[PDB]
Design a protein around this ligand. Structure first.
Ligand SMILES: NCCc1ccc(S(N)(=O)=O)cc1
Ligand SMILES: [Zn+2]
Length: 258
């Protein structure tokens, strides 16, 4: 109820209210590329976002979420390591104060400038709340961001952030196409993990794409102008809203590519 990313409420403190923080399948993790094993058992990943229906964008004090209508299979993730159908509910990002940090997952200890999370729930459990009681309840598609050329499909998101500067603000965000945030390649790593924020629930099949997307310096600078605080409160820029890598423990990361 008062967690955050500060010195006094950040990741090193979460375990006191959320003891699963020290659990057996916490996220994110470092992806050691040389230890990940190619798995021929993985089937192709299927990202089916053609009928995605975005609704709203919300600053929740921790990040911003672009929310989707998940009342029907309009945008789903299937295939790869997944059994069944996972419905897109929201996406959000984690990012840094500087371009050398911001991602949650790391690749051979490399931190990217940011990381996109497309969050999906397993339709066999009927709603998100029931899905987060299940060890295969969620699938999060993670995409790294590096700073270079602008990402045209991100600009509509960047352009609305001025209207949701502070915690609790929302704005209409209809007709946004999340396909414009994907890299060319769907080559991925996958492992079983958790939500990376409280409540840190161990329900997630992580699918982390190998290929980063490029965003421009100007695009990420606009992320960094958001606020963690509410309207009228002293300004605390929304930066460094990432959890560091957690112990891998008894897990293997699988690669979909050689
Ligand atoms: N109410 C739980 C919401 C929640 C959804 C997704 C994530 S993440 N960063 O693991 O994609 C964290 C929390
Ligand atoms: Zn996230």
């Amino acid at each position: 109820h008062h967690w955050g990313y500060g010195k006094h409420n950040g990741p090193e403190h979460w375990h006191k209210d959320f003891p699963i923080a020290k659990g057996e399948r916490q996220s994110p993790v470092d992806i050691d590329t040389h230890t990940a094993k190619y798995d021929p058992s993985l089937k192709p990943l299927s990202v089916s976002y053609d009928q995605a229906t975005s609704l709203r964008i919300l600053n929740n004090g921790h990040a911003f979420n672009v929310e989707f209508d998940d009342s029907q299979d309009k945008a789903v993730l299937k295939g790869g390591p997944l059994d069944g159908t996972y419905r897109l509910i929201q996406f959000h990002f984690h990012w840094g104060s500087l371009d050398g940090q911001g991602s949650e997952h790391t690749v051979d200890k490399k931190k990217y400038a940011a990381e996109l999370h497309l969050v999906h729930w397993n339709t066999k459990y009927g709603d998100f709340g029931k899905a987060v009681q299940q060890p295969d309840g969620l699938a999060v598609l993670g995409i790294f961001l590096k700073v270079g050329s602008a990402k045209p499909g991100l600009q509509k998101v960047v352009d609305v952030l001025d209207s949701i500067k502070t915690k609790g603000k929302s704005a209409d965000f209809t007709n946004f196409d999340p396909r414009g945030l994907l890299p060319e390649s769907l080559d991925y790593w996958t492992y079983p993990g958790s939500l990376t924020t409280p409540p840190l629930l161990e329900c997630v099949t992580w699918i982390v794409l190998k290929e980063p997307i490029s965003v421009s310096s100007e695009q990420v600078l606009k992320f960094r102008k958001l606020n963690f605080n509410g309207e009228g409160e002293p300004e605390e820029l929304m930066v460094d809203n990432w959890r560091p890598a957690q112990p891998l423990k008894n897990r293997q990361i699988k690669a979909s590519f050689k």
